[PDB]
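Submission sheet (multi-component)
Chains listed below:
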Amino acid sequence: DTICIGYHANNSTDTVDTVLEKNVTVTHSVNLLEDSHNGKLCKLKGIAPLQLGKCNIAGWLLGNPECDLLLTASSWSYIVETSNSENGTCYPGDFIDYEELREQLSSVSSFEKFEIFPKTSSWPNHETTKGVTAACSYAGASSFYRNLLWLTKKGSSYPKLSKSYVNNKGKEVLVLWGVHHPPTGTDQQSLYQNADAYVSVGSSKYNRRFTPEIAARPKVRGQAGRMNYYWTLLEPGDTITFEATGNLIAPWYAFALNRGSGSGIITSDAPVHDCNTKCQTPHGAINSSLPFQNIHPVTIGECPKYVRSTKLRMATGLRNIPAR
Amino acid sequence: DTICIGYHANNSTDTVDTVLEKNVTVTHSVNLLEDSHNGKLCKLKGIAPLQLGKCNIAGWLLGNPECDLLLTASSWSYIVETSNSENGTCYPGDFIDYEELREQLSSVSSFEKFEIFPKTSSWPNHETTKGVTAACSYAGASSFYRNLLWLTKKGSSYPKLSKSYVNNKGKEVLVLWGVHHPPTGTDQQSLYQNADAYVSVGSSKYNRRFTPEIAARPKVRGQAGRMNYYWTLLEPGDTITFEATGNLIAPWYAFALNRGSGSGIITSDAPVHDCNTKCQTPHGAINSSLPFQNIHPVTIGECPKYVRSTKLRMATGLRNIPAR
Amino acid sequence: DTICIGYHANNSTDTVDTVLEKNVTVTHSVNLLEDSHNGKLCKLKGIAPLQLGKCNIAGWLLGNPECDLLLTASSWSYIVETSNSENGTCYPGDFIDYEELREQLSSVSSFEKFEIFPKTSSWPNHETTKGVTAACSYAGASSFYRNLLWLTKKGSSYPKLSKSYVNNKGKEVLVLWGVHHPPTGTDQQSLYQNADAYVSVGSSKYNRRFTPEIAARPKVRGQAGRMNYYWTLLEPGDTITFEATGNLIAPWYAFALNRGSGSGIITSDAPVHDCNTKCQTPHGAINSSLPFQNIHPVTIGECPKYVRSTKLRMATGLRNIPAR
Amino acid sequence: GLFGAIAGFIEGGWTGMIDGWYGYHHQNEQGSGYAADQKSTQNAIDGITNKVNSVIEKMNTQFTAVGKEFNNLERRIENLNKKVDDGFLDIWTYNAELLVLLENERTLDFHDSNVRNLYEKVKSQLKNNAKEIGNGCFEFYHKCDDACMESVRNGTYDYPKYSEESKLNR
Amino acid sequence: GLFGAIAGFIEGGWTGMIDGWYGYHHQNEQGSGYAADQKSTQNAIDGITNKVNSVIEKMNTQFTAVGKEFNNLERRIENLNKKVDDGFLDIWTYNAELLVLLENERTLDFHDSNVRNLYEKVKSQLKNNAKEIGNGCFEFYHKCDDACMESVRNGTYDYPKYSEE
Amino acid sequence: GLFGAIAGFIEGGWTGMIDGWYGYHHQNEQGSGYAADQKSTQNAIDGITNKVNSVIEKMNTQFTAVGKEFNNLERRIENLNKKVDDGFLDIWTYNAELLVLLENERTLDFHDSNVRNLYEKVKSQLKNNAKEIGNGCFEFYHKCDDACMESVRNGTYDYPKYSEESKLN
Ligand SMILES: *[C@@H]1O[C@H](CO)[C@@H](O[C@@H]2O[C@H](CO)[C@@H](O[C@@H]3O[C@H](CO)[C@@H](O)[C@H](O)[C@@H]3O)[C@H](O)[C@H]2NC(C)=O)[C@H](O)[C@H]1NC(C)=O
Ligand SMILES: *[C@@H]1O[C@H](CO)[C@@H](O[C@@H]2O[C@H](CO)[C@@H](O)[C@H](O)[C@H]2NC(C)=O)[C@H](O)[C@H]1NC(C)=O
Ligand SMILES: *[C@@H]1O[C@H](CO)[C@@H](O[C@@H]2O[C@H](CO)[C@@H](O)[C@H](O)[C@H]2NC(C)=O)[C@H](O)[C@H]1NC(C)=O
Ligand SMILES: *[C@@H]1O[C@H](CO)[C@@H](O[C@@H]2O[C@H](CO)[C@@H](O)[C@H](O)[C@H]2NC(C)=O)[C@H](O)[C@H]1NC(C)=O
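Outcome: structure written.
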């Protein structure tokens, strides 16, 4: 007659590590490290993400003729760029404070695109065409930005221009414009008449002066002239005033902005499908409730903490010693 | 005849948490998380903080009329702004590198406000009155910054001025000035004559020229014009030369600075009081030798490490088991 | 007849710390904190560091007359400034984005210095000598930078110049130049003979037109004028065009950059020696397999993690109790 | 291990006992079988579920966290930003992998202790009435029926009830 | 309990004993009472004091730490700054809470260890002269007086002097 | 000692035993001397060697890390840089110094447990055949020559065989 004391064992092959020993076979264990992803780019809160395709933020907002697909966009869960996203600035130049703008657009959920300075009625004393360029061509025909207007002297005469907009919208308004810089002094006059022209833009908090910085430059995309692009957030009930005696790439469309939280810009080639998720990465979505993942650092939504680990297995049971 | 080995117990109710078990009543323990605060803003090493009140750094340094309470200031343990510190720049404009100036002030324990370019002696050939504006009024009376002098033409004649200050104060001197940008060529003429004026500021390390940006802007506080504010830290022995043909809002008073660690700027609505503390937060002071606190991340003096926890009770005794 | 179970003991006096007890003598232990160094600056992978000695990055790249020794440098394992590195910009003025430039050089492992615009072949219509100043005197005479060419007027004549460089190096080329701002209109003419000159620089990504700001500043190194320094990274195949009616400190020597990694700049007064290391600090080299070191936080190569600790001894043996 | 029980004086585990982590195996007139000790197991399960939950609960979930862009004149900042991201990554990887190691160590010792204490509850219950064979086994001196076996697994074993063991003791 | 003593084979604690953590409670002919063991209690006090002090030493006081202002074109730097302050806050909150959870577990077991060890220091002195009941009690054989009781808590019991069994 | 052995019921160590962390001493009719237990000693070295290495793995080497310069209008970013460097340094010194304290604690107890388990291994072999003196010594009842001593430390001590043991009077 005998009674023995002992412990569980089974057909488990799961191993764990300790400070004293590595690869200890245990009876039970949890895996704290999520390493499996959807491979897709999914909706968020029901709303699908804005795909920029072969366009980047610069091209989408300015209205690069290759980004006409995006003229319908209004609301999104987050912004997706790809490896082919290079269509943006088609007329050579600097997009000032571009990175900042991208950051601002990350905390935006939707917007209203509206015609701020209608092309047909806004510029009587100035030429509303001519403002197209091969650099920004579409369908083989020279074109230009859909949301900006390249004004030129109407019959060898460029009257000092002054235009204003009042923000009656109940939101911030993204206003974009540009400043042209001819290659030589000859080109300067051909376009704007006026040799010492200027562009002054002023609102309640914004005030800045723009002088045509003329210099000899290599041709980029056919153009030896450069064009710097600008923007600003016009606050509700505020006025913005554009004054120009030349070189002004006037606004034509603008954006009333809806601020959301939890969103941003990622670079990804993972396909976009019709599925919903709570966590999205550049590689794909994550349907997991574990604390860690080693898939990708970039995250949007409620996701597990990213980490470099190959394996994070926590023992729950004890040493497995089935010896039968 | 017997002897028994046992352990201590008592009427203690303190609970601690462990990885294996939650809420374990123990015989003794220590709380490491300071959670009680003073609710008042107090002196530090016998020195009181500088209450800005209705004003901000800008108003205080520039000399906004509504900040005359602050003209007497000289030394302080730290600087406090409130929910209602809106009185700063009264004539619309950009404070250039304003943030950098705040950051500089965080490491200043005192200064000596002095008259760098005395009003009634430094400008024989220019008008030193009539330099007021409704924009900066106190009690319905056109006034101006107490530390800047708005020079204008002396009877349709604004001659080129050249004024140099040699910093021999043995310490860093904070010099402030502005550059006025009238809304029209008319205003430019009445104030300075000289439609093509310039401001040229130069020291050993600082070199920059300013030309007026003349354009019509939305009216801020009844002004379409704008006034940019600048500053530099003149070093001991170094000279600063001001050169203008107009548009110069000259420096009247400057500040010889005294550097001192352990100081800073915080935003608190708590009431100042006559008390001495070694640790101060926006919510109040702290008299504690504990290692942690969850009162506020912002800290001045020798304080406990801020942490997000609500409970940090560390067991010292054993499990408590009276069993009645 | 007896048998005893016991544990080892020895003459070891090594001590360690535990959470419950301080200074426990043990039988065996290992130190994990490296505290020993070379006091020497060593080569990494057979490649010596670059000693700037009395010069700093500016003096080196600009070719300050006091840095002639460095003209020969082509490759290095890391760059070294000292406490005496004062020779940089010997003619007063701002080195624009200098810090960024420094940051650039920290990812450069080598370069090829070349004559972008040969002195005795590039400027038939301008004066290639007489471009010196006492501000940059070297061993008796008024000298100048070795990598830049101060262009002056040629017999009361200074015709608009136009020089372009096409990057045929297959890698980024570092171009440096300067824009001179004389003190008076007199001097402007004495040098450039041409009272309202300009400098324009253009490439695929760079575009500026510099107009001279003639003013009298406090004399630094005897010069009331100022010289501004500019640099750009010309891409392969890109063109950079220079046009000036005066005031141009022309590029003479440029640098085709070879990018690397794990390089950088340090400040040390330690002597260089013909020795080889895998880990380097401003105090000296380190030959260690330990995971920690308390020598210096600045590190070049593969080093132990820096740490404030004074002692990190880990117990391996047991508690030593010789009691013999 | 640390308490000498598991992989120690109790050489191996029983794949035969599927109702718990620790338990008994009895050889009786009535027969054999394995029986899991409810108390010790359910408690150990309580503690282990609490370790896991307390570890998961600390590592707070990651919300929206994308990447910022920098222009060709913002190297320094871009590098600061990288030094940060890489820094926090270095640390959280360390804090995770390191936490798991030590807790695994503690958990295996936890089980070891539990078995140990279970062996000694029984040992101090039996006293003279049984002899310690060695492999965590007690050979009885007084013959224990199933009803008796349960009392041993119950903590309600009546020792004085058996002076019969004293006879067989010799 | 990791050591099976506290809340283990010694089912409860004594509100009666108040001059230490670990101790005894004897019977006698000369009455009953409680006694603290200076040896094992002082040893525990020193240790736990050191643990607390050590934990606090590794937490260096937070000196002057104020936030920074940014203009509307420095959102990237502002978020960076925020990401750094939150990163560090997360880590220090984690460390603090985590260290306390762990050293609390080790602390309770530290007491459980001291009790067992004490129960065994006694049991290894007495041996035959008494038998183990339970509840950490010993039933003597040779009739032990207050002076003999002391010698036990004293660690000087002199086993060779009993056979009155 | 958490496990009561080292600096506990075995008061001190043996400068005599020089070829292992744990072992025996035996006093015979043939003579005496020390002998270390290869089994227990080797398992400990395997454990400790693994602990130290594990500590070292987790501490990835510091690659090239230098400092940046800032101009006088970039103090905010400079201070951020400084807050970042000091921040990360504060944490690593913590982790390092801490990990060593908590492992020295585990290590010293580890040895305690190992001695305890070795003593209790012997005790369970001997049983009636010897009595526990103290100081970790067993007094054989049956006369234990070298081959018998070696069997005790071999894990093969006979029993029953030396059930002449009722010199237990
Ligand atoms: C543990 O230790 C004991 C004692 O050393 C070992 O047993 C002994 O092993 C020796 C060496 O083989 C044996 O001696 C040989 O004896 C045989 C007897 O027929 C004979 O061929 C020669 O005399 C030869 O030298 C010896 O019999 C044996 N002693 C006993 C008491 O068994 C044992 O091997 C060790 N066990 C382990 C697992 O290491
Ligand atoms: C949109 O992007 C595409 C792809 O980058 C541009 O296509 C390039 O155009 C240049 C100049 O005409 C050609 O020399 C290249 O061969 C094209 N590259 C590729 C990969 O096709 C296109 O020019 C852009 N269009 C606009 C309007 O921005
Ligand atoms: C000082 O600050 C106060 C409060 O911000 C200013 O008063 C405001 O002025 C604006 C613009 O004229 C009005 O629209 C608000 O209604 C006023 N608010 C309050 C509470 O008075 C005041 O104008 C400032 N004065 C100076 C000189 O800066
Ligand atoms: C190289 O650096 C040295 C050291 O700074 C310069 O010499 C100093 O020049 C200043 C101004 O002329 C004097 O006030 C110091 O007393 C000088 N120090 C020494 C040790 O001579 C030197 O002029 C620099 N040379 C160049 C070409 O820049």
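Remark: The longest strand of chain E covers residues 22-26.
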